[PDB]
CSV table of C-alpha atoms and ligand atoms in Angstrom, one decimal:
chain,number,residue,atom,x,y,z
T,57,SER,CA,3.0,9.6,19.1
T,58,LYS,CA,3.6,8.6,15.5
T,59,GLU,CA,2.7,4.9,16.1
T,60,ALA,CA,-0.9,5.9,17.1
T,61,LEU,CA,-1.5,7.7,13.8
T,62,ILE,CA,0.0,4.9,11.8
T,63,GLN,CA,-2.2,2.3,13.5
T,64,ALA,CA,-5.4,4.3,12.6
T,65,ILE,CA,-4.2,4.5,8.9
T,66,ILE,CA,-3.5,0.8,8.9
T,67,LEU,CA,-7.1,0.0,10.0
T,68,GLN,CA,-8.4,2.2,7.2
T,69,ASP,CA,-6.1,0.5,4.6
T,70,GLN,CA,-7.1,-2.9,6.0
T,71,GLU,CA,-10.8,-2.0,5.7
T,72,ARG,CA,-10.5,-1.4,2.0
T,73,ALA,CA,-9.0,-4.9,1.7
T,74,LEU,CA,-11.6,-6.5,3.8
T,75,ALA,CA,-14.4,-5.0,1.7
T,76,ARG,CA,-13.2,-7.2,-1.2
T,77,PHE,CA,-13.3,-10.5,0.7
T,78,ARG,CA,-15.6,-10.2,3.7
T,79,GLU,CA,-18.7,-11.4,1.7
T,80,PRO,CA,-19.1,-14.7,-0.2
T,81,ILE,CA,-18.2,-14.4,-3.9
T,82,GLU,CA,-21.3,-15.4,-5.9
T,83,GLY,CA,-21.4,-16.0,-9.6
T,84,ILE,CA,-17.7,-15.1,-10.2
T,85,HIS,CA,-14.9,-17.6,-10.7
T,86,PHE,CA,-12.3,-17.1,-7.9
T,87,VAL,CA,-9.5,-16.8,-10.4
T,88,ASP,CA,-11.4,-14.1,-12.3
T,89,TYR,CA,-12.1,-12.4,-8.9
T,90,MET,CA,-8.5,-12.4,-7.7
T,91,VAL,CA,-7.3,-11.0,-11.1
T,92,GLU,CA,-9.7,-8.1,-11.0
T,93,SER,CA,-8.8,-7.4,-7.4
T,94,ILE,CA,-5.1,-7.0,-8.1
T,95,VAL,CA,-5.6,-5.2,-11.4
T,96,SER,CA,-7.9,-2.6,-9.7
T,97,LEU,CA,-5.0,-1.6,-7.4
T,98,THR,CA,-3.4,0.3,-10.2
T,99,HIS,CA,-6.4,2.7,-10.4
T,100,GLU,CA,-6.6,3.7,-6.8
T,101,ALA,CA,-5.4,7.1,-5.8
T,102,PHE,CA,-1.6,7.3,-6.0
T,103,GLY,CA,-1.2,9.2,-2.7
T,104,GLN,CA,-3.2,6.5,-1.1
T,105,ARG,CA,-0.9,3.8,-2.5
T,106,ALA,CA,2.2,5.9,-1.5
T,107,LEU,CA,1.0,6.0,2.1
T,108,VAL,CA,0.7,2.2,2.2
T,109,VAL,CA,4.3,1.8,1.1
T,110,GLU,CA,5.5,4.5,3.5
T,111,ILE,CA,4.0,2.5,6.4
T,112,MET,CA,5.4,-0.7,5.0
T,113,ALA,CA,8.9,0.9,5.0
T,114,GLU,CA,8.3,2.2,8.6
T,115,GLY,CA,7.4,-1.3,9.7
T,116,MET,CA,10.8,-2.7,8.6
T,117,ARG,CA,12.6,-0.2,11.0
T,118,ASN,CA,9.9,0.1,13.8
T,119,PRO,CA,9.0,-3.1,15.7
T,120,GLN,CA,5.7,-1.6,17.0
T,121,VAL,CA,4.6,-0.8,13.4
T,122,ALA,CA,5.8,-4.3,12.3
T,123,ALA,CA,3.4,-5.8,14.9
T,124,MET,CA,0.5,-3.7,13.5
T,125,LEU,CA,1.3,-4.9,10.0
T,126,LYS,CA,1.5,-8.5,11.1
T,127,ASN,CA,-2.0,-8.2,12.4
T,128,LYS,CA,-3.2,-6.4,9.3
T,129,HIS,CA,-1.7,-9.0,6.9
T,130,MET,CA,-3.0,-11.9,9.1
T,131,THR,CA,-6.5,-10.4,9.0
T,132,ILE,CA,-6.5,-10.0,5.2
T,133,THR,CA,-5.1,-13.5,4.5
T,134,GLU,CA,-7.6,-15.2,6.7
T,135,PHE,CA,-10.5,-13.7,4.7
T,136,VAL,CA,-8.8,-14.5,1.4
T,137,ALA,CA,-8.2,-18.1,2.5
T,138,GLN,CA,-11.9,-18.4,3.5
T,139,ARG,CA,-13.0,-17.3,0.0
T,140,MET,CA,-10.3,-19.7,-1.3
T,141,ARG,CA,-12.0,-22.6,0.6
T,142,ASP,CA,-15.4,-21.5,-0.9
T,143,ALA,CA,-13.9,-21.8,-4.4
T,144,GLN,CA,-12.5,-25.3,-3.6
T,145,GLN,CA,-15.9,-26.5,-2.5
T,146,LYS,CA,-17.5,-25.1,-5.6
T,147,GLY,CA,-14.9,-26.9,-7.7
T,148,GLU,CA,-13.3,-23.8,-9.1
T,149,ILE,CA,-9.7,-24.3,-7.9
T,150,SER,CA,-7.6,-27.2,-6.8
T,151,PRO,CA,-8.5,-28.8,-3.4
T,152,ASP,CA,-4.8,-29.7,-2.9
T,153,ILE,CA,-3.4,-26.2,-2.6
T,154,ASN,CA,-2.1,-24.7,0.7
T,155,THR,CA,-4.6,-21.9,1.1
T,156,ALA,CA,-2.7,-20.2,4.0
T,157,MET,CA,0.6,-20.0,2.0
T,158,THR,CA,-1.3,-19.2,-1.3
T,159,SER,CA,-3.1,-16.3,0.3
T,160,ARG,CA,0.2,-14.9,1.7
T,161,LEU,CA,2.0,-15.1,-1.7
T,162,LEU,CA,-1.1,-13.4,-3.4
T,163,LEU,CA,-0.9,-10.6,-0.8
T,164,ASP,CA,2.8,-10.2,-1.5
T,165,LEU,CA,2.1,-9.9,-5.3
T,166,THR,CA,-0.6,-7.4,-4.3
T,167,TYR,CA,1.9,-5.1,-2.4
T,168,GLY,CA,4.5,-5.5,-5.2
T,169,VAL,CA,2.0,-4.2,-7.7
T,170,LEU,CA,0.7,-1.5,-5.3
T,171,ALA,CA,4.3,-0.2,-4.8
T,172,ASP,CA,5.1,0.0,-8.6
T,173,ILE,CA,5.2,3.7,-9.5
T,174,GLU,CA,4.5,2.9,-13.1
T,175,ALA,CA,1.7,0.4,-12.4
T,176,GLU,CA,-1.0,2.6,-13.9
T,177,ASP,CA,0.9,2.9,-17.2
T,178,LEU,CA,1.5,-0.9,-17.3
T,179,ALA,CA,-2.2,-1.5,-16.7
T,180,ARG,CA,-3.0,0.1,-20.0
T,181,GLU,CA,-1.4,-2.9,-21.8
T,182,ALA,CA,-3.4,-6.1,-22.4
T,183,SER,CA,-0.4,-8.2,-21.3
T,184,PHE,CA,-0.6,-6.8,-17.8
T,185,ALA,CA,-3.9,-8.5,-16.8
T,186,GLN,CA,-3.0,-11.6,-18.8
T,187,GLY,CA,0.4,-12.0,-17.0
T,188,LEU,CA,-1.4,-11.6,-13.7
T,189,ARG,CA,-4.0,-14.1,-14.8
T,190,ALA,CA,-1.2,-16.6,-15.6
T,191,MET,CA,0.5,-16.0,-12.2
T,192,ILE,CA,-2.7,-16.1,-10.2
T,193,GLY,CA,-4.3,-19.0,-12.1
T,194,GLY,CA,-1.0,-20.9,-11.8
T,195,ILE,CA,-0.8,-20.9,-8.1
T,196,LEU,CA,-4.5,-21.6,-7.7
T,197,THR,CA,-4.6,-24.7,-9.9
O,14,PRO,CA,37.8,4.7,0.4
O,15,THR,CA,36.1,7.8,1.8
O,16,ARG,CA,33.2,7.4,-0.7
O,17,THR,CA,32.6,3.9,0.5
O,18,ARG,CA,32.8,4.8,4.2
O,19,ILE,CA,30.2,7.6,3.5
O,20,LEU,CA,27.8,5.2,1.7
O,21,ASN,CA,28.2,2.6,4.5
O,22,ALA,CA,27.4,5.2,7.1
O,23,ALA,CA,24.5,6.6,4.9
O,24,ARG,CA,23.0,3.1,4.5
O,25,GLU,CA,23.1,2.7,8.3
O,26,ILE,CA,21.4,6.0,9.0
O,27,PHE,CA,18.9,5.8,6.2
O,28,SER,CA,17.8,2.2,7.1
O,29,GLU,CA,17.3,3.0,10.8
O,30,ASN,CA,15.6,6.3,10.5
O,31,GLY,CA,14.2,6.7,6.9
O,32,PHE,CA,14.8,9.4,4.3
O,33,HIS,CA,13.0,12.2,6.1
O,34,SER,CA,14.4,11.8,9.6
O,35,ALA,CA,18.0,11.1,8.4
O,36,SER,CA,20.4,14.1,8.5
O,37,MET,CA,23.6,14.7,6.7
O,38,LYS,CA,24.9,15.8,10.0
O,39,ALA,CA,24.5,12.4,11.6
O,40,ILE,CA,26.1,10.8,8.6
O,41,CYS,CA,29.2,12.9,9.0
O,42,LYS,CA,29.6,12.0,12.7
O,43,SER,CA,29.2,8.3,11.8
O,44,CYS,CA,32.3,8.2,9.6
O,45,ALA,CA,34.2,11.1,11.2
O,46,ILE,CA,34.3,13.7,8.4
O,47,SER,CA,33.2,17.3,8.0
O,48,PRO,CA,30.1,18.4,6.0
O,49,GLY,CA,32.4,19.9,3.4
O,50,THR,CA,34.0,16.5,2.8
O,51,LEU,CA,30.5,14.9,2.5
O,52,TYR,CA,29.3,17.6,0.2
O,53,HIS,CA,32.3,17.1,-2.1
O,54,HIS,CA,31.2,13.5,-2.7
O,55,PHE,CA,27.4,13.8,-2.4
O,56,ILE,CA,25.8,17.2,-2.7
O,57,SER,CA,22.4,16.2,-1.4
O,58,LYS,CA,20.4,13.4,0.2
O,59,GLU,CA,19.1,12.6,-3.3
O,60,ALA,CA,22.7,12.2,-4.6
O,61,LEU,CA,23.3,9.7,-1.8
O,62,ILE,CA,20.1,7.8,-2.7
O,63,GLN,CA,21.3,7.7,-6.4
O,64,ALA,CA,24.5,5.9,-5.3
O,65,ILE,CA,22.7,3.5,-3.0
O,66,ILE,CA,20.2,2.7,-5.8
O,67,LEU,CA,23.1,1.8,-8.1
O,68,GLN,CA,24.6,-0.5,-5.4
O,69,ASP,CA,21.2,-2.3,-5.1
O,70,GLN,CA,20.9,-2.4,-8.9
O,71,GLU,CA,24.3,-4.1,-9.2
O,72,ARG,CA,23.3,-6.8,-6.7
O,73,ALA,CA,20.3,-7.6,-8.9
O,74,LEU,CA,22.4,-7.4,-12.1
O,75,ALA,CA,24.9,-9.8,-10.5
O,76,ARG,CA,22.2,-12.5,-10.6
O,77,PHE,CA,21.3,-12.1,-14.3
O,78,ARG,CA,24.4,-10.7,-16.1
O,79,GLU,CA,25.7,-14.1,-17.0
O,80,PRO,CA,23.9,-16.9,-18.7
O,81,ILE,CA,22.0,-19.4,-16.5
O,82,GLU,CA,23.3,-23.0,-16.9
O,83,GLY,CA,22.7,-26.2,-15.0
O,84,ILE,CA,19.3,-25.1,-13.5
O,85,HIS,CA,15.9,-24.5,-15.1
O,86,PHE,CA,15.1,-20.8,-15.5
O,87,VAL,CA,11.9,-21.1,-13.4
O,88,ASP,CA,13.8,-22.7,-10.5
O,89,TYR,CA,16.6,-20.0,-10.9
O,90,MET,CA,14.0,-17.2,-10.5
O,91,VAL,CA,12.5,-18.9,-7.5
O,92,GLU,CA,15.9,-19.5,-5.9
O,93,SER,CA,16.8,-15.8,-6.4
O,94,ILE,CA,13.6,-14.8,-4.5
O,95,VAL,CA,14.2,-17.3,-1.8
O,96,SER,CA,17.8,-16.2,-1.3
O,97,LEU,CA,16.6,-12.6,-1.1
O,98,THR,CA,14.6,-13.4,2.1
O,99,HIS,CA,18.0,-14.3,3.7
O,100,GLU,CA,19.8,-11.1,2.9
O,101,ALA,CA,20.6,-8.5,5.6
O,102,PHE,CA,17.2,-7.2,6.9
O,103,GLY,CA,18.4,-3.6,7.2
O,104,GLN,CA,19.4,-3.8,3.5
O,105,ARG,CA,15.9,-4.9,2.6
O,106,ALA,CA,14.4,-2.1,4.7
O,107,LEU,CA,16.4,0.5,2.7
O,108,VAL,CA,15.1,-0.8,-0.6
O,109,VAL,CA,11.6,-0.4,0.6
O,110,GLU,CA,12.2,3.0,2.1
O,111,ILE,CA,13.7,4.2,-1.2
O,112,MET,CA,10.6,2.8,-3.0
O,113,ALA,CA,8.4,4.7,-0.6
O,114,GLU,CA,10.4,7.8,-1.1
O,115,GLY,CA,10.1,7.4,-4.9
O,116,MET,CA,6.3,7.6,-4.6
O,117,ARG,CA,6.6,11.1,-3.0
O,118,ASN,CA,9.8,12.4,-4.6
O,119,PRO,CA,10.0,12.9,-8.4
O,120,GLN,CA,13.8,12.9,-8.3
O,121,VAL,CA,13.9,9.4,-6.7
O,122,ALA,CA,11.1,8.2,-9.0
O,123,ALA,CA,13.2,8.9,-12.0
O,124,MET,CA,16.1,7.0,-10.4
O,125,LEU,CA,13.9,4.0,-9.7
O,126,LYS,CA,12.5,4.1,-13.2
O,127,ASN,CA,16.0,3.6,-14.6
O,128,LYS,CA,16.9,1.0,-12.0
O,129,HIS,CA,13.8,-1.1,-12.6
O,130,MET,CA,14.1,-0.8,-16.4
O,131,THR,CA,17.8,-1.9,-16.3
O,132,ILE,CA,16.9,-4.9,-14.2
O,133,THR,CA,14.0,-6.1,-16.4
O,134,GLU,CA,16.2,-5.8,-19.5
O,135,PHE,CA,18.7,-8.2,-18.0
O,136,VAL,CA,15.9,-10.6,-16.8
O,137,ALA,CA,14.3,-10.5,-20.3
O,138,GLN,CA,17.6,-11.4,-21.9
O,139,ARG,CA,17.9,-14.5,-19.7
O,140,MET,CA,14.2,-15.1,-20.6
O,141,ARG,CA,15.2,-15.3,-24.2
O,142,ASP,CA,18.1,-17.6,-23.4
O,143,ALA,CA,15.6,-19.8,-21.6
O,144,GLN,CA,13.2,-19.7,-24.6
O,145,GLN,CA,15.9,-21.0,-27.0
O,146,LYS,CA,16.5,-23.9,-24.6
O,147,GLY,CA,12.9,-24.9,-24.6
O,148,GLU,CA,12.5,-24.1,-20.9
O,149,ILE,CA,10.0,-21.3,-21.3
O,150,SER,CA,7.0,-20.7,-23.6
O,151,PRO,CA,8.2,-18.9,-26.8
O,152,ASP,CA,5.1,-16.7,-27.0
O,153,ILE,CA,5.4,-14.7,-23.8
O,154,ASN,CA,5.7,-10.9,-23.6
O,155,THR,CA,9.2,-10.9,-22.0
O,156,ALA,CA,9.1,-7.2,-21.2
O,157,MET,CA,5.8,-7.3,-19.3
O,158,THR,CA,6.6,-10.7,-17.7
O,159,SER,CA,10.0,-9.4,-16.4
O,160,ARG,CA,8.3,-6.4,-14.8
O,161,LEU,CA,5.6,-8.5,-13.1
O,162,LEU,CA,8.3,-10.9,-11.8
O,163,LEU,CA,10.2,-7.9,-10.5
O,164,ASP,CA,7.0,-6.7,-8.7
O,165,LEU,CA,6.5,-10.1,-7.1
O,166,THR,CA,10.2,-9.9,-6.0
O,167,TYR,CA,9.8,-6.5,-4.3
O,168,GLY,CA,6.5,-7.7,-2.7
O,169,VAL,CA,8.4,-10.6,-1.1
O,170,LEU,CA,11.3,-8.3,-0.3
O,171,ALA,CA,8.9,-6.0,1.6
O,172,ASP,CA,7.3,-8.8,3.5
O,173,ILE,CA,8.6,-8.5,7.0
O,174,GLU,CA,7.9,-12.2,7.7
O,175,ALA,CA,9.3,-13.5,4.4
O,176,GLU,CA,12.2,-15.4,6.1
O,177,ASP,CA,9.7,-17.2,8.3
O,178,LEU,CA,7.6,-18.1,5.3
O,179,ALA,CA,10.7,-19.4,3.6
O,180,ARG,CA,11.1,-22.1,6.3
O,181,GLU,CA,8.2,-24.0,4.7
O,182,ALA,CA,8.3,-26.1,1.6
O,183,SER,CA,5.1,-24.6,0.3
O,184,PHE,CA,6.8,-21.2,-0.1
O,185,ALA,CA,9.1,-22.1,-3.0
O,186,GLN,CA,6.4,-24.4,-4.4
O,187,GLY,CA,3.9,-21.6,-4.5
O,188,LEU,CA,6.5,-19.3,-6.2
O,189,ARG,CA,7.2,-22.0,-8.8
O,190,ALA,CA,3.5,-22.2,-9.5
O,191,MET,CA,3.3,-18.5,-9.9
O,192,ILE,CA,6.4,-18.0,-12.0
O,193,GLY,CA,5.9,-21.3,-13.9
O,194,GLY,CA,2.4,-20.1,-14.7
O,195,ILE,CA,3.4,-16.9,-16.4
O,196,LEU,CA,6.3,-18.4,-18.2
L,1,C3G,O1,-4.0,-3.9,2.2
L,1,C3G,C1,-3.9,-2.8,1.5
L,1,C3G,O2,-3.3,-1.8,2.0
L,1,C3G,C2,-4.6,-2.7,0.2
L,1,C3G,O3,-5.5,-3.8,0.0
L,1,C3G,C3,-6.3,-3.7,-1.3
L,1,C3G,O4,-7.3,-4.9,-1.4
L,1,C3G,C4,-6.6,-6.1,-1.6
L,1,C3G,C5,-6.5,-6.6,-2.9
L,1,C3G,C6,-5.9,-7.9,-3.2
L,1,C3G,C7,-5.3,-8.5,-2.1
L,1,C3G,N1,-4.7,-9.8,-2.3
L,1,C3G,O5,-4.6,-10.3,-3.7
L,1,C3G,O6,-4.2,-10.4,-1.5
L,1,C3G,C8,-5.4,-8.0,-0.8
L,1,C3G,C9,-6.0,-6.8,-0.5
L,1,C3G,C10,-7.0,-2.4,-1.4
L,1,C3G,O7,-7.6,-2.3,-2.7
L,1,C3G,C11,-6.2,-1.2,-1.1
L,1,C3G,O8,-7.0,0.0,-1.1
L,1,C3G,C12,-5.4,-1.3,0.2
L,1,C3G,O9,-4.6,-0.3,0.3
L,2,C3G,O1,16.6,-4.7,-7.0
L,2,C3G,C1,16.9,-4.8,-5.7
L,2,C3G,O2,17.0,-3.8,-5.0
L,2,C3G,C2,17.2,-6.2,-5.1
L,2,C3G,O3,17.3,-7.2,-6.1
L,2,C3G,C3,17.7,-8.5,-5.6
L,2,C3G,O4,18.1,-9.4,-6.8
L,2,C3G,C4,16.9,-9.8,-7.6
L,2,C3G,C5,16.4,-11.1,-7.3
L,2,C3G,C6,15.3,-11.5,-8.0
L,2,C3G,C7,14.7,-10.7,-9.0
L,2,C3G,N1,13.5,-11.1,-9.7
L,2,C3G,O5,13.1,-12.2,-9.6
L,2,C3G,O6,12.9,-10.2,-10.6
L,2,C3G,C8,15.2,-9.5,-9.3
L,2,C3G,C9,16.4,-9.0,-8.6
L,2,C3G,C10,19.0,-8.4,-4.8
L,2,C3G,O7,19.3,-9.8,-4.2
L,2,C3G,C11,18.8,-7.5,-3.7
L,2,C3G,O8,20.1,-7.4,-2.9
L,2,C3G,C12,18.5,-6.1,-4.2
L,2,C3G,O9,18.2,-5.3,-3.1
């Protein structure tokens, strides 16, 4: 079945995301870390990014795939929120933010950048990382 | 009109099955025409996608063609994203399927390049209108800022659970913090 193959690809895509956030972030401001995490998406293999978006499109017309993506996005956002709480205790970001919602909106900005066909060209401009820095630092402070 | 009935049937078949699995044959049966009538209006599946992209582009341009008055520009952008989470879900699914097809089809990638450029040009014009009114910082790169705002919009558009997230007050407040941060 097609759903079984998609589920295996989702776990592999999820694993690349978990590698960014599974460990405590030492010696790096969380705003600087989130900026580099989203900017580095533009340099991953394009066919790998295209496969993520193809599965995202399938999930919007396939309830079984939508359930797999709900689990994938839940898993990623819980780890991002944990690193967010670490930054709050270290005094790096505001202790008043809604970490669950903030992680979800950061993940949506992530997939919006991931799906941009011209993201690699935009990343060559200095205003690309600065604009992301202003968006990311804005919601975290 | 026959061209509209074709597009409506194509939007239904494309959204439910995707670009690859959709057939021109099934589109013909949906609106009760022959393949020759369909070919006369749209010669290929890519020609259909081109017309659908223009329909979606016009919905975006409908939000930014006229000047924004009575509401702050930051809140207008946030309201536009919030309202998008309430649109027909099959319509959102088609936008993402076209974006997915554009990453594997250079014909569609060229169409999306024109659509996204046209949208950011209108958003940037409203950005300059907001700069003259003192609502936005005057020192922003309007071109890059518009594209990043469009990417955040498509990320929310592609979130299957976006309408559930919109039920909470922290959703719009988080968007205001993001959009207010870059502007
Ligand atoms: O989930 C995914 O499919 C993608 O996640 C990416 O890592 C993340 C970066 C930032 C955020 N965020 O700002 O939320 C979440 C995850 C991987 O680099 C990518 O290879 C993978 O395809
Ligand atoms: O482009 C598109 O396909 C979609 O655009 C949406 O309108 C926008 C809203 C906010 C922003 N923004 O904040 O950059 C840009 C455009 C339409 O409601 C939607 O029907 C259409 O499918």
